[PDB]
Design a protein around this nucleic acid. Structure first.
Ligand SMILES: Nc1ncnc2c1ncn2[C@@H]1O[C@H](CSCC[C@H](N)C(=O)O)[C@@H](O)[C@H]1O
Ligand SMILES: [Zn+2]
Ligand SMILES: [Zn+2]
Length: 842
DNA sequence: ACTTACGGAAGG
DNA sequence: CCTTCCGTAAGT
């Protein structure tokens, strides 16, 4: 019996209906509808009432889909031909945003939608008040029908942000004009005038300044290098091989896009027009190419041991239109920098280095020529709710922004792992509801003599509520267990409301944005905007930020009104197109995050080979904890995880002890990519212990699948439900997968083998072959993926201690957030705090 | 403590 | 029509 969630009155008032039993109280044309007081500006007008500037009015739409429109008058000028004009800056009602019907009917939002309009279209004068956060907004934990507005709404990305504090002065007009000037690339600093073109030293695009000698990303189609590029099985032996007709290899990186084409700008020129003057509309850049290691004559096999940010210089140049440039990088000579390249790589984002030049004609490496050489903030005190082993906390710690001073996790192994990993934090082993109810009163000491965090002592509240009820792998979500699992979101929001931290982060599975027609996400956003927070939501792919594993996780961010709402991080590593589906459809509206890198990215994809090609071979049912490395790291991922320190001890290289039948099943699965249970031979086998494996028998005709070529049947039960003795044990082929494969996508990926060039599927708590996520066997060895292999799939450093038995270690590793993803989010928050500090300084 | 049998909505 | 994927009761 889980304990009910304790909530403040504020949070309970919104979640009252959904979790009723789980919480205990604690534009188009318009219709015309008339006197005065180049362009003459006057303060007031008389439409039977004294309309002025700064007060909001209403506009009646012709269509009946929207009841009425609300606008704000910004200026009142007179036009001769048009008539009496005024500039209307529109409002978005609460029932049209992402909040849906959840928002109260008296909530309005600012938007960047404005236009000129005639005075006859005004229907009535409506009072709208700017509700603002109080001076004690940080200390409001736990507490007439006119329209009020408090937040500004970005429709494309579904963002809420505090109103921007900045003669017909319209904020929307200025912002849109800034956008128009942002999109157009503009050129400056004339250098030399030539007969057929003009030379320019610098240029500007989207607020980024490009100069002769910088680095530029280009799309994979921008140019190309000079190097030239590039049976019916027996139905008796494999009765279930006919199910491999989809011809879609799971976890394949073959179709992944290529990374960005890096280059160095050599000159900027414009072609002279027919009038003898430069054309500032088309800008043509000449760029020296940079060979990636997989672009040389040595193909991808050259990108197994090489650094992620390594390139080769070349003397081949190309011409590309300026609009194709997709960013800026710092491609600097490796030995030019006084510091080592290892520190330089982490010195800043978007940094590449080259050390040797490449010649395509002779396919040889030379010394790059002479001209190619080219000669604080205090960390936020953090409370982390529902931590576990502390993936998010570790990511933020290595991002350099946070400092986890408290934790909430009752499960003993996870709590002790958190204790071991963060020696300076106080971890509570209790229920979140009990601790919150205790801290409502000034208890300031729990039963174990630990100090609870007081109001004003928490600055960053981060965590992820249990996602076992939200996930799609959960067939029982209407039971009490799943409901009480879902109800912890309300407890998390209660902590957020009570403490009022500067930043609030809620992580969950992707299905969180679609559970019960996205009712939970909508309710969370409504609570966040009712608190007074600036909240945004999105879906991030874990595999695009450094890990070798597909994991789409929903992130909800919020910041205090004085703060700035962080932008979602930009992808760094390319990933398979079928995996990067980050759009969110809520109430038939499609929201996409501010992420612009949708196709490609700077760095290349991380594969399984880069993850676990250095771990020594281990046998099934391993139990040794401290083993020794048999070799140095053999990739960038392993070199980064292990570190430059001399540690020859490997921990947590253990695999679950599978029985004899499961070992025999995982022994007969071939090593070819895309292999799973479907091609298991149907032959009698002798297990490790002395016991016989029967042959699976098909006694019932399969109507939907028909009969095989040999005439044998395909059904295994009376389902087309189960008679007694229909189940058959001790068979190499499992019985359940043939029994119910027709209505479950033929159980693709069960007993599956990872491929070296592929990627991990979404890691779960228990890596068992027969689970819904079943692609767990090693690419070569006949065993399940070890604990260390799983932790590397999640990007955990090899020096990240885990506590408990093997099942508890697997649960800790599979329940966490990949530290690369948390590091990216922390870097975005670092940018936000740096901007706020810079604004505060001057 | 361990093993197994597997619903159904969303997005292309 | 195919693919996703923080797993859970039920049995043993
Ligand atoms: N029947 C049950 N009733 C209540 N909790 C249970 C339970 N079965 C398992 N649990 C535990 O509930 C945990 C998720 S809720 C526990 C975390 C809690 N909110 C906190 O303050 O830290 C799981 O780790 C699980 O170990
Ligand atoms: Zn305007
Ligand atoms: Zn059956």
């Amino acid at each position: 019996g889980p304990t009910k969630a304790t909530t403040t009155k504020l949070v309970y008032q919104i979640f009252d209906t959904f979790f009723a039993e789980q919480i205990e109280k604690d534009q188009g044309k318009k219709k015309k509808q008339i006197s005065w007081v180049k362009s003459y500006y006057k303060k007031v007008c008389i439409d039977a009432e004294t309309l002025e500037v700064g007060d909001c009015v209403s506009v009646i739409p012709d269509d009946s889909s929207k009841p009425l429109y609300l606008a704000r008058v910004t200026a009142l000028w007179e036009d001769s031909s048009n008539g009496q004009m005024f500039h209307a800056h529109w409002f978005c009602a609460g029932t049209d945003t992402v909040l849906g019907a959840t928002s109260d009917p008296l909530e309005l939002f600012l938007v960047d939608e404005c236009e000129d309009m005639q005075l006859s279209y005004i229907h009535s004068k409506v009072k709208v008040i700017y509700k603002a956060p109080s001076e004690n907004w940080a200390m409001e934990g736990g507490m007439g029908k006119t329209y009020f507005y408090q937040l500004w709404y970005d429709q494309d990305y579904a963002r809420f942000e505090s109103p921007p504090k900045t003669f017909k002065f319209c904020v929307s007009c200025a912002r849109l004009a800034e956008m128009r000037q942002k999109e157009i690339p503009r050129v400056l600093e004339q250098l030399e005038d030539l007969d057929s073109r003009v030379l320019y030293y610098s240029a500007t695009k989207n607020g980024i300044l490009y100069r002769v000698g910088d680095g530029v990303y280009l799309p994979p189609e921008a140019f190309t290098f000079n190097i030239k590029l590039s049976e019916p099985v027996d139905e008796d032996l494999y009765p279930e091989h006919y199910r491999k007709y989809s011809d879609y290899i799971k976890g394949s990186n073959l179709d992944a896009p290529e990374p960005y084409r890096i280059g160095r700008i050599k000159e900027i020129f414009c072609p002279k027009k027919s009038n003898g003057r430069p054309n500032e509309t088309d800008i043509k850049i000449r760029v020296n190419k940079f060979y990636r290691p997989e672009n040389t004559h040595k193909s991808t096999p050259a990108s197994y041991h090489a650094d992620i940010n390594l390139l080769y210089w070349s003397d081949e140049e190309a011409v590309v239109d300026f609009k194709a440039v997709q960013g800026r990088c710092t491609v600097e000579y490796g030995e030019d920098l006084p510091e080592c390249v290892q520190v330089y790589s982490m010195g800043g984002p978007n940094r590449f280095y080259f050390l040797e030049a490449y010649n395509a004609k002779s396919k040889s490496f030379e010394d790059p020529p002479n001209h190619a050489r080219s000669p604080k903030l205090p960390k936020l005190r953090t409370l982390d709710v529902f931590s576990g082993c502390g993936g998010l906390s570790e990511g933020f710690h290595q991002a350099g922004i946070s400092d986890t001073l408290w934790a909430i996790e009752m499960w003993d192994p996870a709590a002790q792992a958190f204790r071991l990993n963060n020696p300076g934090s106080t971890v509570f082993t209790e229920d979140c509801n009990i601790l919150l109810k205790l801290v409502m009163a000034g208890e300031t000491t729990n039963s174990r003599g630990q100090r609870l965090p007081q109001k004003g002592d928490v600055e960053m509240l981060c965590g992820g509520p249990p996602c076992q009820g939200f996930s799609g792998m959960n067939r029982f979500n209407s039971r009490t267990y799943s409901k009480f699992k879902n109800s912890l979101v309300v407890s998390f929001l209660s902590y957020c409301d009570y403490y009022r931290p500067r930043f609030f982060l809620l992580e969950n599975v992707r299905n969180f944005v679609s559970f019960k027609r996205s009712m939970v996400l909508k309710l969370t956003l409504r609570c966040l905007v009712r608190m007074g927070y600036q909240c945004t939501f999105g879906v991030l792919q874990a595999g695009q930020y450094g890990v070798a594993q597909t994991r789409r996780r929903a992130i909800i961010l919020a910041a205090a009104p004085g703060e700035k709402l962080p932008l979602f991080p930009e992808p760094l590593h390319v990933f398979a197109p079928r995996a990067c589906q980050l759009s969110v459809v809520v109430d038939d509206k499609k929201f996409v995050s501010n992420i612009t890198r949708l196709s490609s990215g700077p760095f290349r994809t991380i594969t399984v080979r880069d993850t676990m090609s250095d771990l020594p071979e281990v046998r099934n049912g391993a139990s040794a904890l401290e083993i020794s490395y048999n070799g140095e790291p053999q990739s960038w991922f392993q070199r980064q995880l292990r570190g430059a320190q001399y540690q020859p001890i490997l921990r947590d290289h253990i695999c679950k002890d599978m029985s004899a039948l499961v070992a025999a099943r995982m022994r007969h699965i071939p090593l070819a990519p895309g292999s799973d249970w479907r091609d298991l031979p149907n032959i009698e086998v002798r297990l490790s212990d002395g016991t016989m494996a029967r042959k699976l028998r098909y006694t019932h005709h399969d109507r939907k699948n028909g009969r095989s070529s040999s005439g044998a049947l395909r059904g295994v039960c009376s389902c087309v439900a189960c008679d007694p003795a229909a189940r058959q044990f001790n068979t190499l082929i499992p019985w359940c997968l043939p029994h119910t494969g027709n209505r479950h996508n033929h159980w693709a990926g069960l007993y599956g083998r990872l491929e070296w060039d592929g990627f991990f599927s979404t890691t779960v708590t228990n890596p068992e072959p027969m689970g819904k996520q079943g692609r767990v066997l090693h690419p070569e060895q006949h065993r399940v993926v070890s604990v260390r292999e799983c932790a590397r799939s999640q990007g955990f450093p090899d020096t990240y201690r885990l506590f408990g038995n093997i099942l508890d270690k697997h649960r800790q590793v599979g329940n966490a957030v990949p530290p690369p993803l948390a590091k990216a989010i922390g870097l975005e928050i670092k940018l936000c705090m740096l901007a706020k500090a810079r604004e505060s300084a001057s």
